[PDB]
Amino acid sequence: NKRMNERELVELETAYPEQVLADSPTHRVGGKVLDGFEKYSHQYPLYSLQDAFSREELDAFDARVRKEVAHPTYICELKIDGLSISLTYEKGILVAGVTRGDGSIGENITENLKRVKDIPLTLPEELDITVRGECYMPRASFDQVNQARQENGEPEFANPRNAAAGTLRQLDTAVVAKRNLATFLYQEASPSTRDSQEKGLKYLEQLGFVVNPKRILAENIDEIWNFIQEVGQERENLPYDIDGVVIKVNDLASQEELGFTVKAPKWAVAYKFPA
Amino acid sequence: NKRMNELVALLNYRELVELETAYPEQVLADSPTHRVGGKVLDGFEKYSHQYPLYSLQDAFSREELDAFDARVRKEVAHPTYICELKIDGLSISLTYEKGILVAGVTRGDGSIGENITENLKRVKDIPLTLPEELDITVRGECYMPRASFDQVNQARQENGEPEFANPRNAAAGTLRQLDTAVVAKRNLATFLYQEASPSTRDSQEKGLKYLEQLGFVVNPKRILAENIDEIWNFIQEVGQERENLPYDIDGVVIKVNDLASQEELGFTVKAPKWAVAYKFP
Ligand SMILES: NC(=O)c1ccc[n+]([C@@H]2O[C@H](COP(=O)(O)O)[C@@H](O)[C@H]2O)c1
Ligand SMILES: COc1nc2nc(N)nc(N)c2nc1C
Ligand SMILES: COc1nc2nc(N)nc(N)c2nc1C
C-alpha cells in the first residue's frame, strides 16, 4: 500500500488489481475494453432547457420571471455543443460518470470519462457531490481524429459533437485516451451548495472542475441581447462549437419559487442562433 | 482606484499608506495595513449575534464520560466521536459577507457581543478575505501562545507595567483594550472549531477540513474515536503532554461527529445534547 501511495506502478497495479489508487495517473491511459455499458438511473433527474428563438421570446421569459421576482439578475453562459454528462463523487472520489440518456436512465461510461484529462479523479475535500456539464472535442483536434477514423476504415465524424459523443459511447477506453476531449461543467445536480449560480461556478472551479469563462451577469434583456450579439460575432473564433446562450436567474431562492415544469426549469431558457 | 489593487496585490508600502490616508473609504479589504497599528476606539460598539452561542455541558470523570456515551446511544446505535482540545482563550465569532471579514465579535451575553473587529484584524492567523465570496460565520478561540506571553511579560516588566497572571488574562487584556496597535505588537493566534452559520459539511471532521480550505487555522490535535475507551486514552495522553503544548487548555470537548446524528439528539435549554467538555484541573 505505502508502496503505491508513493513504469513501476503499472507492474504493482497489474499484480494486485484488487487495490489501484483513485488518484492513480494510470486511469488516464488506455485500459480495458468493456462488455457494454451498464444502465444507470439518475439519482437527481437531469432536466432539459426550454428554447427561445428571438428577442421577443427572451422578452417573454423575462416578463414571466418578473411575475414572481422583482429584481432579477441574470447570468448568461454558453451552451457548449457536446455530449451531456453527469459525474458523481463519493468521499471526494469520482464513482460514476454517466450520459444524460432520457433524463432518467443513462449509460454508465465512468471508465471512458476517466480518460478525459480535465475530469478530476478526486477532489480536495471528502465530498459527496454530483455535477453536470458537457464533454466535447475542440475544433483543433477534429481534423486529426477524422484522419484516424479513415485509416481504421470507419466513417468520419459528421462534426465535433458527434466525434465526442461517438468517442465516449464506443467500448474501448484506450480510444478515449488518444483523442483530446475536454469539459465544461455548469452546475451541481445534487442540492446547490452556494446562493447563486455565479457562486456555484466559482465553487466548482475551486473543486478542480473546468468552468467556461465567457459569461456575464445582466439586469435586463438589453444587456443580454448585446452579449448574445457579441457571442454571435466571435463564434467562428472559439475553439469549440456552441449551439446557443443559456440565460438563468442568478439567485437560488429566486430560482426556488419560480420552480420547474415537468421537463425544464421555469427559471432558465436557451437562446438558439438563427441558421 | 487602480494603483491600489496593483499596490495591494504586489505588496501582497510607503505609497499605499499615503493613498490610504488620502482616500480612507477605499482602503481595500486585504490591504496589509490592516495588520499594522491603526485606530484607537473610544469604546466598543454593540453587535447582535445572528447565531447566538450556546454552552457546553461539563464532565469531571471517566464515569461521567461513560454516562454521556450512554445517553447518546439511546438515539444513535453506533456513534463516532470527535475529540478536540478546549483552548484556554477568548471566544470570538467571525462573520464574513461576500468573502470579506466584516465583523469580529465577543460572546457578550450570548445574543449581543462586543464588536472588536479592528482589534481582531491585527491577529495575523485570521483571514481578512476568503477564497470565495461567501456569507459565513465561524466561531473559535483567540489565545496567546505561551512563548508570546513570556515575551510580552518581559516587555511589560522593562516598561514598568504589571505582568499578566497567565496567557488567558493576557489575551482578554489585549483584545478588550481599545488600541489596535497594542494588539499588533502582542502576537495573538486562533483555532476555529465550528461554523456558526448552518453547517456546509455533514460531519465535524469534514467541517474542520473545510475551514482549513478557507484559510482558517484549526488545531491538528484531535481524533475520531469509536468508544469511550479510545477517548479516555486520548485525554490521558493529552493530560500527560499538557505541559509540553505551546498554549494552555481548559480540557477536551467530545462531540458526536456526524450532523444527522447531532440533529436527532438535539439540545436542552442551554446546551447541545451531543457534546460534552471533560475538564482538566
Ligand atoms: N477582493 C477580494 O480579495 C475578495 C473578497 C472575496 C472573495 N474573493 C475571491 O478570492 C480571490 C482572492 O484570493 P483570497 O481572497 O483567497 O486571498 C479573488 O480573486 C476573489 O475571486 C476575493
Ligand atoms: C439550468 O440547467 C441547464 N443549464 C445549462 N447551462 C449551460 N451553460 N449549458 C447547459 N447545457 C445547460 N443545461 C441545463 C439543463
Ligand atoms: C459544541 O459546541 C462547542 N464546541 C467547542 N469545541 C471546541 N473545540 N472548543 C470549544 N470551546 C467549544 N465550545 C462549544 C460551545
Q: For chain A, which domains are there?
A: 39-260 (3.30.470.30)
3-state secondary structure string across B119-141: HHCCCCCCCCECCCCCCEEEEEE
Residue B271 CB–ligand 3 contact under 6 Å: no
Looking only at the bridges linking them, the beta strands covering B223-225 and B81-87 are antiparallel
Chain A contact set for B208 (CB, 8 A): none
CA of B193 to the centre of ligand 3 (A): 7
**Neighbour count for residue B154 (Cβ, 10 Å):** 11
The answer to whether the CB of A111 falls within 8 A of the CB of A119 is no
Q: Which positions ≥6 away from B257 have C-beta within 8 Å?
A: B79, B80, B81, B82, B203, B204, B205, B224
List own/partner pairs for A200-208 with CB under 8 A and 24 or more apart: A202/B132, A202/B133, A203/B132, A204/A131, A206/B131, A206/B132, A206/B213, A207/A120, A207/A123, A207/A124, A207/A127, A207/A129, A208/A120, A208/A123, A208/A124
User: A185 forms bridges with which residues in the sheet?
Assistant: A133
A199 interfacial to chain B (CB closer than 8 Å): yes
Q: How far is CA B202 from CA A44, A128, A184, B279, in A?
A: 19, 10, 27, 27
Query: Taking each helix axis from N to C terminus, what angle separates B14-22 and B3-11, rounded to the nearest 10 degrees?
Result: 140
**Is A141 among the annotated ligand-binding positions?**
no
Shortest-distance ligand to the CA of residue B192 = 3
> What's the rounded Cα separation, in Å, for the pair A186 and A131?
8
**Is A77 among the annotated ligand-binding positions?**
yes
B201 interfacial to chain A (CB closer than 8 Å): yes
Annotate B157-193 with b (16+ C-beta within 10 A) or e (fewer): eeeeeeebeebbebbbbbbeeebbebbbebbbbbbbb
B133 interfacial to chain A (CB closer than 8 Å): yes
CA of A247 to the centre of ligand 2 (A): 9
Closest-lying ligand 2 atom to the alpha carbon of residue A49: 15
Select from A129, A194, A204, A207 the residue whose CB has the most chain B CBs within 10 Å, as the one to mutate to test that interface. A194
Q: What is the DSSP letter of A153?
A: T
> What's the rounded Cα separation, in Å, for the pair A143 and A136?
14
From B132, B133, B209, residue closest to A125, measured CB to CB: B209
Question: How far does B171 lie from chain A, in Å, by closest CA?
Answer: 33
Residue whose grid cell is 499608506 = B17
> What dihedral do alpha carbons A238, A244, A245, A249 form, nearest 10°?
-150
**Among A209, A274, A253, A268, CA closest to A77:** A268
Considering Cα of A74, then A80, then A83, then A85, what sign does the dihedral take? negative
> What's the rounded Cα separation, in Å, for the pair A227 and A233?
10
B212 interfacial to chain A (CB closer than 8 Å): no
Q: Which amino acid belongs to residue A220?
A: N
**Among B104, B110, B247, CA closest to B188:** B247
**Neighbour count for residue B61 (Cβ, 10 Å):** 10
Please confirm, yes or no, whether A67 is among the known catalytic residues: no
Yes or no, beta carbons of A125 and B210 under 8 Å apart: yes
> What's the rounded Cα separation, in Å, for the pair A161 and B167?
65
